[PDB]
Amino acid sequence: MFDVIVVGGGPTGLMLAGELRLHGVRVLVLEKETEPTRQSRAQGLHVRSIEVMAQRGLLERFLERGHTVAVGGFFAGLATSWPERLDTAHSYVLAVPQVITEQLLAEHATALGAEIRRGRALVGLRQDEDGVTVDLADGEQLRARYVVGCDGGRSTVRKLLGVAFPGEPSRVETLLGEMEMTASQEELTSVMTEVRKTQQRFGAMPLGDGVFRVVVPAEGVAEDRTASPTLDEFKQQLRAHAGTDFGVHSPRWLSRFGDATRQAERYRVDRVFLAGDAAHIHPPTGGQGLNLGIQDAFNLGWKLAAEVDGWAPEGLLDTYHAERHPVATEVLDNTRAQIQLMSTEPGPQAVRRLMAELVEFENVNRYLIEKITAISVRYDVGEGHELLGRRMRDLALKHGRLYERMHEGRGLLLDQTGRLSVAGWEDRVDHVVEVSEELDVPAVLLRPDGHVVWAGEDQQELLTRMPAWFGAAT
Numbered sequence: 001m002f003d004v005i006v007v008g009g010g011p012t013g014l015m016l017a018g019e020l021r022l023h024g025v026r027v028l029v030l031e032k033e034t035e036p037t038r039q040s041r042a043q044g045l046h047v048r049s050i051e052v053m054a055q056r057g058l059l060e061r062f063l064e065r066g067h068t069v070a071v072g073g074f075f076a077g078l079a080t081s082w083p084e085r086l087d088t089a090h091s092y093v094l095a096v097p098q099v100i101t102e103q104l105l106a107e108h109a110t111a112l113g114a115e116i117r118r119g120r121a122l123v124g125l126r127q128d129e130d131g132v133t134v135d136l137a138d139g140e141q142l143r144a145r146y147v148v149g150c151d152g153g154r155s156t157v158r159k160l161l162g163v164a165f166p167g168e169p170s171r172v173e174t175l176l177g178e179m180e181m182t183a184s185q186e187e188l189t190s191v192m193t194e195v196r197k198t199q200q201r202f203g204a205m206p207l208g209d210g211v212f213r214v215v216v217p218a219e220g221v222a223e224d225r226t227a228s229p230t231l232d233e234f235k236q237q238l239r240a241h242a243g244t245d246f247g248v249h250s251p252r253w254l255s256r257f258g259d260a261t262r263q264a265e266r267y268r269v270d271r272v273f274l275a276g277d278a279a280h281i282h283p284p285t286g287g288q289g290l291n292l293g294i295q296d297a298f299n300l301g302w303k304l305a306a307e308v309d310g311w312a313p314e315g316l317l318d319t320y321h322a323e324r325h326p327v328a329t330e331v332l333d334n335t336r337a338q339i340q341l342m343s344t345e346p347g348p349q350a351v352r353r354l355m356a357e358l359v360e361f362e363n364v365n366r367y368l369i370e371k372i373t374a375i376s377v378r379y380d381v382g383e384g385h386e387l388l389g390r391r392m393r394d395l396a397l398k399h400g401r402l403y404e405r406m407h408e409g410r411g412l413l414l415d416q417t418g419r420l421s422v423a424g425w426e427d428r429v430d431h432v433v434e435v436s437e438e439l440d441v442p443a444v445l446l447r448p449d450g451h452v453v454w455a456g457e458d459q460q461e462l463l464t465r466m467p468a469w470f471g472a473a474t
């Protein structure tokens, strides 16, 4: 038997898979696809995920196989400027194909001692009070204390629990594909930049592979939800929205995605959880899809490992739903807003012209970039300091950076005084004493995910909030 079984080998499960191994947890990653899809779906990590990959040391290998981007135009394609006061030390956008992201997270989680069987497909599941049982299409039953569903929008775990997927259906179809075109490099760059003024969900991305990532709107609503668009369909759209089919020489793949904004009603059913697209689907606008799943897994693994190790507080697991569900709503909302700001109708365009006036304000631009990147995500932890709930940025200390002490996923107590000490939580929380000109407060208590639950200077006050998130002393 296992401690935790995850269902899904995407970036969400493999992040959860490694976040458990840090604490020694028997994890099994069940993945249906035998060969990982080369269909580059996403295109990179935003600021918070980059922060996340640094708190665990995986950032060096992400920058080797991607490149940084510091340009504006993420909110509804309102081309702007990258802000200059982002409250972070990783003020850029990383451009890594999801295939490489899946690869590095798997190679890391594998190297952390995590079974990942591919070709296994969960067909049924049921749970008692002592664990959860899992039936596969081949016939193997599996036992685990906790099962988490990280298996995409059409999640099988979600449907086997009765968790509803309420929201708005897909009403704006859009076509996408990686293909060559019979046109001069200048020919694309002069037409795209020209027509974009009216249609804002249209453009071309060369990724070096000689071929181009081209997205073009679609007419109507596809009923099949599984019918690949013919090249002729793809060509007619380019002509109807840009005037020239560009002559596609050949497609490597053609996809058709919608704008459905659904979100699971419950993130937890006793011993079964949901994370990633399995708990929330939404339009790709803003690049928050993959970043949302990584940070859901980054919210749960240390809580799930806190329970299997038998030191988690009472309602720790219940907060996974109570902290990550409001994030998906707000993200599902602005995607609804960004899609609206791209509508061709006279109304939406008028509101687009209005936002175009507002993003000229430095604080307004900073406010939206802080929202797409989710660096201003704040949990309700408890009354107190202005820092409670928010994540701590990479503070430059006397010796080294802050995100260098957080690799082993342990709770951190950054002290500037030397008169603090945890007694009875050494087994879970570390004690880092270092100076930082960036932290006006004397001390900060960080959860394994960087979110502050206490910031101050009194120890008797610290002795209150230590057990509420780290358990009773030894």
Ligand SMILES: Cc1cc2nc3c(=O)[nH]c(=O)nc-3n(C[C@H](O)[C@H](O)[C@H](O)COP(=O)(O)OP(=O)(O)OC[C@H]3O[C@@H](n4cnc5c(N)ncnc54)[C@H](O)[C@@H]3O)c2cc1C
Binding pocket: 007, 008, 009, 010, 011, 012, 013, 030, 031, 032, 033, 041, 042, 043, 044, 120, 121, 122, 123, 150, 151, 152, 153, 154, 155, 156, 157, 176, 255, 257, 275, 276, 277, 278, 284, 286, 287, 288, 289, 290, 291, 292, 293
């Ligand atoms: C056109 C398009 C463009 C996108 N662009 C971006 C972007 O620019 N930036 C961004 O951040 N996000 C983007 N996304 C979203 C991104 O693809 C997802 O958010 C990302 O995959 C989330 O991680 P995941 O592991 O939960 O998803 P998934 O890849 O769907 O993980 C599901 C895995 O579990 C497997 N599985 C399914 N059922 C079972 C079962 N019963 N048993 C075992 N295994 C099962 C699946 O086969 C799959 O391998 C885009 C999506 C689309 C469709």
Ligand SMILES: [Cl-]
Binding pocket: 108, 111, 112
């Ligand atoms: Cl490693």
Ligand SMILES: [Cl-]
Binding pocket: 158, 159, 163, 164, 165
């Ligand atoms: Cl469902």
Ligand SMILES: [Cl-]
Binding pocket: none
């Ligand atoms: Cl006008």
Ligand SMILES: [Cl-]
Binding pocket: 357, 358, 360, 361
């Ligand atoms: Cl202005």
